Design a binder for this molecule. Structure first.
Ligand SMILES: [Ca+2]
Ligand SMILES: [Ca+2]
Ligand SMILES: [Ca+2]
Ligand SMILES: [Ca+2]
Ligand SMILES: [Zn+2]
Length: 316
């Protein structure tokens, strides 16, 4: 809508207060004009019809419990946009400031969130397996990174290339969590998964096997579930990425960490320069090595740590 850019205040899913960018024209809408061509948040009102209605509010105050997922989806889309702009010089997901759109209150008791090809969608959860999914910044950034992947490498959502696709979203979802820097960890979804159980998460990058996910190529899932295990075999790549950043010894191979910034720069380059739609794990290794070579030299510690980390998870 056309109006005056302004600032509202609201409470998110976890009860924390934040400021959000809004647009005023009779109502106050969740439209943020300060970022590229805009961030737009919609109410799907418990239906599956998308996008729903652009979020309208009478007083620019978003403290109703019904408002909370909209506040978070809107605010964390913001932070994610900022991460890509400030750290990798990418303007929105298409690289040309495309509008970011999100719908919340999608369906009823829906325990997921997804990028549908054109927008993010967030369920409310059923109140015991999940609370509203936009409450976790790693989740929001994971979903938005899918949009990024679709516009660059375009990894097919199947088998190994799908696992890479999922791993890239977890990796940057985690980097974005560290960027916004409030309780960052190497777990996925910990803020919104099982509200009545502390210490757990949906997936772990530091130890994927914690939840039964492979952490070595020899343990990869080769059946047909989950599109050939795109959320399962990603644990192998997630583990490599964790090692590259933080270091450690894994299956007897030792890896010197090079830290988060470099891991981000390497994986973003691999993603935007060398990965293609059918890249498999072995090609991801070559892409990451080549990336680190471009950035730090063939005989750097960085190239050596990348090699170390893929040897550790059994990927040649
Ligand atoms: Ca209000
Ligand atoms: Ca966290
Ligand atoms: Ca996390
Ligand atoms: Ca939990
Ligand atoms: Zn995903």
């Amino acid at each position: 809508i056309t109006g005056t850019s302004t600032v509202g205040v609201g409470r998110g899913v976890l009860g924390d207060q934040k400021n959000i960018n809004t647009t005023y024209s009779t109502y106050y809408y969740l439209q943020d004009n300060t970022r590229g061509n805009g961030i737009f948040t919609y109410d799907a009102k418990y239906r599956t019809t998308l996008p729903g209605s652009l979020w309208a509010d009478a007083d620019n105050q978003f403290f109703a419990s019904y408002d909370a997922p909209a506040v978070d989806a809107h605010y964390y889309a913001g932070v994610t946009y900022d991460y890509y702009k400030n750290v990798h010089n990418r303007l929105s997901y298409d690289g040309n400031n495309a509008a970011i759109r999100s719908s919340v209150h999608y369906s009823q008791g829906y325990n997921n969130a997804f990028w549908n090809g054109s927008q993010m969608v967030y369920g409310d959860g059923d109140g015991q397996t999940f609370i509203p999914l936009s409450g976790g910044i790693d989740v929001v950034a994971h979903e938005l990174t899918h949009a990024v992947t679709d516009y660059t490498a375009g990894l097919i959502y199947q088998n190994e290339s799908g696992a890479i696709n999922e791993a890239i979203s977890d990796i940057f979802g985690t980097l974005v969590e560290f960027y916004a820097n409030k309780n960052p960890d190497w777990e996925i979804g910990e803020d919104v998964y099982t509200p009545g159980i502390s210490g757990d998460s949906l997936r772990s990058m530091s130890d994927p096997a914690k939840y039964g996910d492979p952490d070595h190529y020899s343990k990869r899932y080769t059946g047909t579930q989950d599109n050939g295990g795109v959320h399962i075999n990603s644990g192998i790549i997630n583990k490599a990425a964790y090692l590259i950043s933080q270091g450690g010894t894994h299956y007897g191979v030792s890896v010197v960490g090079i830290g988060r910034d470099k891991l981000g720069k390497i994986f973003y380059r691999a993603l935007t320069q060398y990965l293609t739609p059918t890249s498999n794990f072995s090609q991801l290794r070559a892409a990451a090595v080549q990336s680190a070579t471009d950035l730090y030299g063939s005989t750097s510690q960085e190239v050596a740590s990348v090699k170390q980390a893929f040897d550790a998870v059994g990927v040649k």
